[model samples]
Target chain A: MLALGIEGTAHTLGIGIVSEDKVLANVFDTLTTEKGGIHPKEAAEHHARLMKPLLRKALSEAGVSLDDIDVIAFSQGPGLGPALRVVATAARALAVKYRKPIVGVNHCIAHVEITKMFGVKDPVGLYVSGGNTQVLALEGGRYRVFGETLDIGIGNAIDVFARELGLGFPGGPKVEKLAEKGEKYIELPYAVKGMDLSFSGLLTEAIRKYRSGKYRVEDLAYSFQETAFAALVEVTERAVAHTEKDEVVLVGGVAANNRLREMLRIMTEDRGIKFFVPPYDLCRDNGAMIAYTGLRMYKAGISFRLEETIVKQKFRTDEVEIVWH
Target chain B: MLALGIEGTAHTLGIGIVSEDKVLANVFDTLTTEKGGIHPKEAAEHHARLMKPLLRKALSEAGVSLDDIDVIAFSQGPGLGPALRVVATAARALAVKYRKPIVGVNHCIAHVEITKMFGVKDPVGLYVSGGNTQVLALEGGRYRVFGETLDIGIGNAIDVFARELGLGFPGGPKVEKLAEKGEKYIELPYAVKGMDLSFSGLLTEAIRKYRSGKYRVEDLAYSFQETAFAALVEVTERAVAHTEKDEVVLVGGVAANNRLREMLRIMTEDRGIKFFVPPYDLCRDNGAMIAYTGLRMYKAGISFRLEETIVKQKFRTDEVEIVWH
Candidate 1:
């Protein structure tokens, strides 16, 4: 069956048409600017205004009408309220209009599902974003958060520093660009508590050093990204070893950073375990994963009732069951 | 002695003419937008653009020319690099032009000075802001980070949630407003470690609840503010008990929140220890505090040569010696 999915978790408003064989159409519009990051309310409002047009465009592009879609999927939780509300309202309205089954997909679980689809072979997943940085594993049909950020999301911390340095909003890309030109690396305190990690101190220290004129911005960004990414890779490698998983998947907006992917790739390749990452667009917020997840749920006969359909801003990934087996 | 102090820290550019008796002219302009938080480079650029006019207005408003000022003071460290560069450069040029001595002041120390001005009788200070928050005690003529955020600044965390909930930029004030309208509070996990505090987990849980649709936005806002403020207050109370400080002073921008101020006031009053908060204007980012600190430093015969002047984004308050007796 064909499924159409919508995602409005953070800054991106995305629509995807997917089937069992391939993702037919995946389109996304990022709500970011030079000033800084996207404001959730603004992002949601933008999504609400743009959803119909974007959906129509996606459907037309995919050459599939609403009647061709068997399931309608929407991101359920772990996102901004206004953004999620827009996606949910749109999804529910469309579902009812089309007389199609509606599925509420967990955002994090969708990340995990996309990773699983990339041929990871039941590996532990490391999901990192502006609001979430977690080491997760599928157990008993739930993605358990084994470790997470102790204070702030790694991406948020990095973005804060980026903003402090006058880099544009969605700092990950800019930092990545400048880091390539860096001549040196600076050492920041790596605070790893058991399995959980902390980045606030590191970001603060980097901001201090940058302001002190002791190091160039490029060098600081380079050192910070390398060091932080190294730390994450080390922890993930350790988690893979501890969990005895033969594979690992990196998912989330930060996963698009090449430095992190390189380090994890090296480690996983050396360990002879599979390492997987979705396409860059999929790494950030997207609807393809949601559609794919919805397809799985729809196949399992797990669809939301019309009256029970509502958007959740903070749906935990572990609460859902993978009934498609 | 008359002192002209400049502050380039975080988003606000402040210029103040300060004397022993009162503030002559205190001017503050915030760098803000509808998108993300402050961009340090942009903020610095804006500061540069505004510095001359602001300084002239401040001097004129105080009915004094540049030459009439006894000392030129500027925040030397613990601020954005480009932003600090703008302030330091402006102050240096003015000092050189007027043949005045330039005193480099610590940003954190300036925060402490506000409390000292209030005649707190050496109370321990609880400083909270977007960039910094700590339980500080004046020890060996320096304010130390007795207890601080293990990951992100409390204000930043609150701001992140506010942004997630579609609140506008500068989440602190927005969340406070929402909390006031809230009828009930959600119970969040309060993570306070001895002297170190963690807001990440608490934020994660709060965001989770928000995503789940189980909690109302206003209620979540109410609970989040109460929980975070209580965490701060609880730690401050403990610090008071441990340090035996006769009073408690709340500093930084977040301290301006009415809920936090009331909670702290009630706690200090119940404990019979005086509570001091600078005037609401002083509580937020301003140049008055910087000018006052400069006056104090000048009186104490502390001055910095151009070579010794440096901008620090993350200057530790404890590293500086209070040269002014």
Candidate 2:
């Protein structure tokens, strides 16, 4: 079955067309302007303006039309309120107009689902983004959050420092750029609270050290990325060992980081367990995963009521249930 | 004694004309957009754009031209790097063109100086802003940090919640508004560590409650404000008692909160002590306080050399010293 997916979780507004075995079209229009992340109101306005064009572009690019789509899918929660509302409203309106089944997919779950698409069976998932970083396990048809951020997301911490340093919005990419030029690593405090991790303190320390002129910005950036990624990889390894999972799946926007991917691959290979990562496009926010998950739900006859209002933001992912049964 | 003070700390670009005992013209423009806070590069661009206009406006509005200005005062440190650079460059250029002496003022010290403006005698000051929140005492011609936030500023904590709730930027005011409308108080973990305080855990708990749907959003907002303000007030009270000070000053942008002001007023009054809060304009980011402090420094023959650079975001305010001696 063909499905159309819409993703407006954080900063990116992504649209994807997919079938069970193939992704026909995956298009992303990033909304990184003056602000780092997507502002709900601004993002919503952008989505509203771009929705029609993006949908049409995706359809033409995919060589498909509205009549060819059997299901309409969209990210349900854990996103900016206005942004999510725009996507949901678009999805619902299109689904109603086309007489196709509409399915709302949990964003974090879609992250895991897309990773699952990589053929990693029942693997533990590590999800990281601008707003969240977590080690999650699928249990009893729900994603159980094992570890998460104690303060701010890793991306935000990085961006805050980047902004302070006169780097533009979205500090993660800037930090990565500086890291590439770095010659040495400046040690920053690695805070691991049980399974949960905190990145704000580390970022704060890095900023302090950077301002002190004791260390080069590149070295400090490099050390920060290495230490933060190391902490995450260590925790994921521990979670895999504790859960006894034979495979591990990496998800979230930060999963696109080459260093994190390399570290996870090395650790998983050493442990003799399979590691799976979605394509880079899927690693970041995209509609293909939502469409894939929606296709599953539509086939299972799981859909929302027409009167159901779209959730704008969600802190906990567990409150959502998979109704595939 | 007349002075022209420029403040380019954080997002606001403020220029003020001050006489010995009165503010002649405090013309200010906030560079805040729909985006979160000021980006250093953007702030620099903004400072450059507004410097001439701001100076002209202050002069025009105060009915005094540049010739009447005795000194040019500017914020020197504990701000965004690019932002400070922009402001410092403007100050230097103006000083050279007008042949006026420039006094470089510490932003944090300027915050404390607001207390002095209110005629607080030996008062303990509570300073809270987007980048800083601390309990300070004056000693040996410098402000000493008695206690401060360990992870994030109190304003930032409020911003996080506001973001979580899909509220727009400047979450502090939004949260304050929501709190007023709230009818219930949600219980959040109060993390008071000896003389220091923490809002991370409390923020986590509040996020959890928000996700649970077990509490109303307004209630959560109200409870968060009360709890955080209470902790701050309690700490300040203790500091006051310990130091045996008869006066307390509320400084920084957060001091603009009517609720916090009311609570502090009641607490101080109950203890038979005096509580001083600068006018609302002074409470927010402005150049008047910076100019005030600069005047004091100028009288002592303290100035920054051409080789000096801005500090850009200092975490510990106590480490700063007035070089006037």
Candidate 3:
């Protein structure tokens, strides 16, 4: 069976076609502003404009027609409202036109399921993206979130800091690069309450220090990374210790950060747990994860009616039953 | 100046009219289910169908017409996606038709702002409801959320438990009443992580114990309230201690529960901080709070363009600049 998926939760509009064992096509477009952050309205408009063309491109790249697709899937949310609505509308429209089943998959779980292709089972997932920061694991037929950001997502914290510093949009990589040359470590708040974390204070303090003119930008960036990554690693370790799971998998847009990966790797090594991260494309927001998750749900006899495809803006990870697992 | 507001964040559809000093009209309708929880799509449709008549009723009750209104306001979010869209759409259309300035107020802050009429300034707020459980205080001209639930809202937790026990929807009062007769205290999870709290674990354990059929329902209900309320009051105390505020205010749908109010009152009295609870009408989700918040923002030179009235599903309280404060 073939699954066609569309993911437009935020800035990125991705289309992917997947078979049971492999990804046949993966393509996406992301909206990037030179300054400031995403306005949900503009982001939704971008998704609406790019969705049709991206679908067409994916079909051609996969050498498949609508007749070959068995199911239609969409990222049903925990995202920007306008963007999620656009994606859900397109998914429902295509499903009705093609006379196929529709599946609305949770965006956070897609980040975890896509990593299963790397041959890890029941691993603790550290999902860090522009809009989500969660540590999840399969337990009692659900992917229960063990920890999450108490306020803003980590990528959002970095993006906000970069914006205040005039470093433009899509700030993760830029901040990563600047931090590589730092020789000093400026102090920032380390906010970890039990297994959960908070980054708003860290973001505020970093920006405050920048305005003070007493610290170099590189040191501030480096210090921000160290403090944030340490808290994240600490929480992931707590999840690992709590669940006694021997495997740790990191996935999401922010997983592209080398420093974060390095810190997690060190912690995993200290615990003697296996660590896994997928390719860069899979690590970021992509339709393939959505397609693969949908495929698993379809095979497990789960699909939604057209009326059931409404977007869930605060869709929790544990709400989904892990029948496939 | 007069402000007309519409609120449809979830099950509640409220229309409120207010001036600088008093509320002229306060009206609302809430969706209730007998056996299940809210379906976002149906709730949205309910708002769309009732928006026009509710507007007319609010205007008439306020002794005003559309031309007399100085601004239009709506609950802009941290709410259900479909419901928020319906309210925002109505607010924007009215703003355009009447040529009035529009403001989108945070729903959570509206709960706190409406309490200011009770003559309390800068108090720690324990705002609990079906979709929200937060402890907030004003600092640096922004309402900073000091603590909150890690998973589902407290009211949602109670609702789910009641449903599993064959009790109907709108479960807070039913559970509260049942708890009053209990003599035993069955143990449930007590989750308090520093200043933050979680309810999903408590809910799951309570349901598990109920399914075992080893205890009376009343005892379980009593235990659930004690555990949940203790955690809530604990976090509110932490916020109070940290902020050194002289007062505490309780607001939201769950504030209508006398047990929760009494627990919070006991804690506040212990700390020698004055406690306040508004009239039941203002405690639950209502439009007057929206209108009053908008009036304050309008007087402070804050208004949104038509395009800027887009719904924010995860609108954080601190995201709004408190110029009026």
Candidate 4:
């Protein structure tokens, strides 16, 4: 059976088509905002305008018609409310028109499930995205969250700090670029609350330091990375120790960072745990993750009725039963 | 713990607060459209315009603050897309702000559960609304749809015929008023296909008869009732006999019809089965039922993270597992 999955849970609106064990197509377009972080309303409008063309392109690239789709899947939640609303509405309209069963795949679970497609099994997941940062594990048939950010997301903190330095949209990657040239490390606040972490204070101080002219942007970026990555690696290590898992998987938009991957690689290497990170294309937001997760769920006899298609903005990872393993 | 429920599945946007069996407050504001059928966009705009005041009113009526709410329940689907989107967004915002768990309740199940609250047990339900007409019963621990309209909802048929005639908005009650004065019934199409009924044919013929100028408007109304109500009664009675249930229930907006109630009452009375219909206030769309269902779910430890709160536009009755029962 072929499944078409739509993703517009955050900045990007993507369409992915998957059948059996193969991915037929994955296409997406993201909304890039001005200096002000992300405007949810505009992002939602972007999704609405982009859905039709993206879906058509996805189907065309997959060499299948809309009728060939046996199931429909959508990134159902834990993202921007406006963005989610558009994806949910579009998916429902398509499902009703086509008379196909649809499933609302949890966005975070989709990130983890997509990694499984890359041959990782029973791995501890450190999912970091622009809007989400969590350490997850499959605990007793549930995608239990081991640790999470208590304030702003890690990527959001990076973007906010980047904008202060006059970096354009997507400050995360830009900050990484400048950090590569700096050798000295400046002191920055480190926030690690038990298993959870906080990024708001760190971001505030990082921006304040940049304004005070006490530190160069490159050294500040380097320090920011050292402090933030250290906290994340520390929490992930504690979780791996607690779960005693032999595998650790890094997945998300932020997972595209070579430094973050290396830091996690070092920690897992010390523990003799296999580390996995899918190619960058799969690591970032994409429709294939949703389609794959939907395939897993739909095969498990879990399908959403049209009325059950509402987008969830605060859906947690642990809430899913993860019965499809 | 108190649960606040929001309902905006269609033209009506309702809010209610409930704790256990007690209804602290139940309030709603219906979106009155001009001549056209519910414009989904306008209805959604109405929901957006009215949600703030309605929420305020519900909180004040319940004599509680937003912090007092333990659960925020919202109608998750089987309604207009734009309207559900607004309601879902508002619900998630409130849930995140107050740090309370939210639940998305099925509108149809809310109808059934409200009747159960009035002390009905194990009854076959005949639910007729502007967009839905179905007969339901609890079978195998899940609400099952035994029979339903093959075409438009009963209320939709009524409103269409009423519009074709010169009756104002919400033709059901107006048709009931005109039918009350009729002395005789003219011939109209009778559409009962096996156990399922079809009202489009009957409504088509009824409207055709009105245009022919051969029948009085009141008598046409009478004939419409006799023909349409009989089809609903036949399917309902067959469900009652086939299932061998002890009770029958009349629900939804069309359930407010005294003629339909009388017809079903006679059928059940002859079958020696109890007939149940909640008061008109309870029969139509309301938030208390949503709150009540949410309360039941939350008490059962079924709470949605903000992410699981997307609304479904075509949510079905049997789609829900009804595990709490």
Candidate 5:
């Protein structure tokens, strides 16, 4: 069955049509700016404005009309409330209008489920996004969170710290670009607690040092990325060890950082395990993941009644009953 | 624990607070209209505007603050998408802001649940709202549908037919008043089949007859109400016998019609079963029902994570797993 997925757990409103095994079209609109970081309300408004155009584009690219879509899947939560609500309402409207079933996909689990499409099986997932950072694995009929952030999310920290200097929204990529020119590695705090990681201290210290007139911007940016990357990979490595999973997968917007990807690849290579990453489109917030996960759930006979279609903003990854597994 | 409920599955934006056994406060704003019937988009906008005032009024009258609300509940579906989304999002915002658990309650079930608060137990529920009409009873740990309308809902048929006569909005009350003044009973189709009923045919025939100038408006209105009431009572009687439940409860917007309520009461009395109906405010769409049902679910250990709080418009009552039982 062909599934149409609507995803807007955060700033991006993405639409994707996925068949049984592959995505036919994945279209999205990202709201980005250099001032004041990301305002959840404003970002959500942008999504509402863009939903219609993005959906038309998705269907156009897929060479299919709404009638070809069998099921409506939506990212039910783990991101911004307004953004998620818009996506969910659109999905429900289409589902009811078309007389199709709907599945509310867990956004976090979708990130992991979408990767399985690329032949990455039973891998430990390191999900890092604007609002979520966690290491997850399928366990006991759910995606168990083995480790995660204890404070501000990694992506938010990067974006907020980037706005500190007016660097821009999604400062991670810009910082990655500048980190290449650093001469000396400025010392930053390394915080890895058991299997969990903390980014607030590293963010504060890096921001303070940059404001201290004691370090170059390039060096500070370089050091901050390195410190944060090390903390994330360490916990993920530990989780991999705990789960005894031989494959490590990176999913989420922050997985776009070249240095971190290289670090994870090297670390996994040394452990004689495969490291996998979906191309950048799926790595960031997108609809294909939601559609694919919804299809998986629908195939498992998991369909929601209209009353059960409410969207969630802080849904836990492990809260989902993993019937597909 | 005190529960706050936000209800707006249809035209009314309602807010209420309920403790375990009683309602503390209930307030609502209905978007009444005549020219176009209840427009989903406009009604949703009205809900967005009134949600703020109703919430503050509900809390103020209850002599409580947001902090005192132990759980936030909302009418999650079986109504208009835009209206339900407005309520769901507001509920999620309050739940997150207050650090309280959230429960997305089914709108139809809320109708039945609130009656039990008035001391009606295990009654066969006849829910006849603008968007729904179903005979429900507890079976297999869920509220199962014994029979329902196959076409347009009861309230819609009344309101739309009234609109055809250039009668003002909320056709149910107007229809009831006009029917009371009529001295003759006009002929209309009796559309009950097996255990289910259809209203659209009867609605079409009544409207066509009204337009044909063959019957007086008052007589047609009286005939329509009588025929419609019989259809509802017939199915409700079957469900009462099938479930062997001794009580019958009338709920929803149409339940406020004295004629229908009296008919149901007489029917139940003839069967030697108790008849119950909430006060007019509770019978129509209101937040008290949601709050009471929410408290019931919360006490049952059914609470939602922020992400699991999305709204579903076509929600089915039986789809909810009744762990509370």
Candidate 6:
């Protein structure tokens, strides 16, 4: 059987097709501008415009027709409203047209489940994206959120700080580039309550330091990355200790950061557990993860009624019942 | 100064016109289906189609035109994503067209602030809506969430259970009606962790009991209401005691439930503190609350640029800095 997945939870519009054995096609497009952060309407418009073409491209790459697909799936939530709707509307229309079963997969869980290709078992997941940061572990037929951001996501915090410092959209890479050139470390608020971490206070303090004109942008970027990434790693480490998981997998758009990878790698090595990162394409928001997870759900006999397919903007990670597991 | 407020956070699309002293006009339309619950796309489409007419009606009733409005305000979120985008887009277009400043107000905070008309000061607020259940209190210049739903909102939980019980879209009122005829109480899960309450378990157990075909719907509804409202009042009572506040205010769509009101009233009376409920119209989702709160924020020198007008899907209550207070 084959599954086609649509992902437009935030800035990226992705389409992927997969079979039981391998990914048949994986394709995506991201929305970016030079001057500002992502506006939901613009992102939604971008997805609506590119959705059909992307779907055609995925089918072409897979050398298959719509009739070859057995089921449909889409990112259901924990995302920007407009973007999620665009994807859901497209998915619903396609399902209705093709008379196929539809499943709404959690965006965060897809990030974790896609790493299943790596052959890791029972690993704790650290999902860090522009809009999400959570430490997840599968417990009792569900992926329990062991830790998470109490405020903004780590990538969002960095982008907000980067924007304040005049960095453009897609600020993660630019911030990372500048952080490498810094020679000084500035102290910022490190807020971690129990297992949950918060980045809003750190973002505010970093921006305030920049506005005060007492620090270089490079130093600020470096300090911000160090502070935020340390907090994330700290929570993930604690979740690992609490969950007693022996392997760690990091996924999401922010997983592209080299420093964050190094920090997690160091921690995993010190803890004597294996560390895993999916291929770069899968690491970012993509339809392949949604497709793969959807394929699993479909095989597990899970499907949604048209009414149940309504997009959830705050769909939590643990809401899905892991019947396949 | 006149403020034009737009509220399209969920099923309701409301427009309100207000001055410093009194509300000039408040008009709202709610989307309801006899069969299914709210779909994000349907809700967005509802708001978009009605926005222009609602604005015109509000202006007509207020004896003013767009040019006379000093500022445009909108419910900026903790709501359905597509619905929020429709409201934000409209607010932005009007703000730009009339060259008026725009302030993005929190929907949750709007509910609390609207109660100011009732002459209650420094009161702990229990905000229960279709998409939110939060125990909020003003502390350290911001409204902090003393307790909240750890999972789905109470209204959503109730609606889901009502749907499972063959009740239609807005199951709240129908369930309440049936609950009044209940003769026996069936035990369900009572989940309260710390100050936070969860209703998913209660919803699941209620549906399971209904599926068993052993108990009447009235008894199940009564038991569910009793269990859920007791958890809410327990948390609110705890918050009031912790804050040592003399007043408790109930606001939100769910505040319309008489059983909930009675439960809270009984709690407050026992604690020797005052309990207050805003007018029914203000309690549910509406634009007058948005306009009132936005007017306050605008007067306090809080405004958002076009870029900053992006709606937040998970906007927290404490995120807003209460400079107006």
**lDDT of the candidates, in the order given:** 0.81, 0.80, 0.87, 0.84, 0.84, 0.87
lDDT of 6 by residue, A189-211 (tens): 98565437788888888888899
Per-residue lDDT, model 5, residue A219, is 89
Candidate with the greatest TM-score versus the true structure: 3
Lowest lDDT block of 10, candidate 3 chain A:
A138-147
Every prediction: chain A TM-score: 0.93, 0.92, 0.97, 0.96, 0.95, 0.96
Per residue, candidate 2 scores C-alpha lDDT tens digits across B1-325 of: 7888999878899998877678888888888777474477888898889988888898888899888888888888787888888888888887888898887777877887766655666888898887677887764344655467777888878888899999988788889999999988767888555446789999988999899988888899999999999888887876676456788988888887889999999999989998888887888889888888888777777666666544455524544555542
Candidate 6 local lDDT, B1-325, one digit each (tens): 8898899989899999988778899898989766655589999999999998898899999989999988898999888899999999999988888899999999999999988855878899999987689998876556877568878889888889888887766789999999999999899999565437788899888999999999998999999999999899887886776567999999998888999999998999998989999988788899989999999999999988888889998887867877887
Give the per-residue lDDT of model 1 (tens digit) for B53-151: 898899888999987899988887787788888899998898889889898888877887866666656878888988677887764344545467777
Of 1 and 3, the candidate ahead on DockQ is 3
Residue A42's lDDT within candidate 2 is: 80
Winner of 1 and 5 under lDDT? 5
TM-score of each model, paired residue for residue: 0.50, 0.49, 0.53, 0.51, 0.50, 0.51
TM-score, predicted candidate 6 vs. hidden true structure: 0.51
Flag regions of model 4 displaced more than 4 Å.
B1-325
Give stretches of model 5 more than 4 Å off.
A1-325
DockQ-derived CAPRI band for the predicted complex in model 1? incorrect
Candidate 2 wrong stretches, greater than 4 Å:
A168-170, A180-185, A323-325, B1-325
Residue-level error in angstroms, candidate 5, position A182 = 99
Q: State the displacement of the C-alpha of residue A171, model 4, in Å, after optimal TM-score superposition.
A: 1.7
Q: After superposition, how far is residue A210 of candidate 6 from its true place, in Å?
A: 2.0
Which ten residues in a row are the worst by lDDT in model 6 chain A?
Answer: A191-200
Off by over 4 Å in 6: B1-325
- Which pairs of residues have clashing backbones in candidate 6? A81-B81
Residue range A1-325, candidate 1, lDDT tens digits: 8999998888889899999768888998877555755488899888988898889888987888999999999998888888888888899889879899898988888887876555556878888988788887764444655566778888888888888988756688899999999998788878565446778888888988988998888899888887777768766775676456888888998888888888888999998988888787777778989998899889888979966567777676656756674
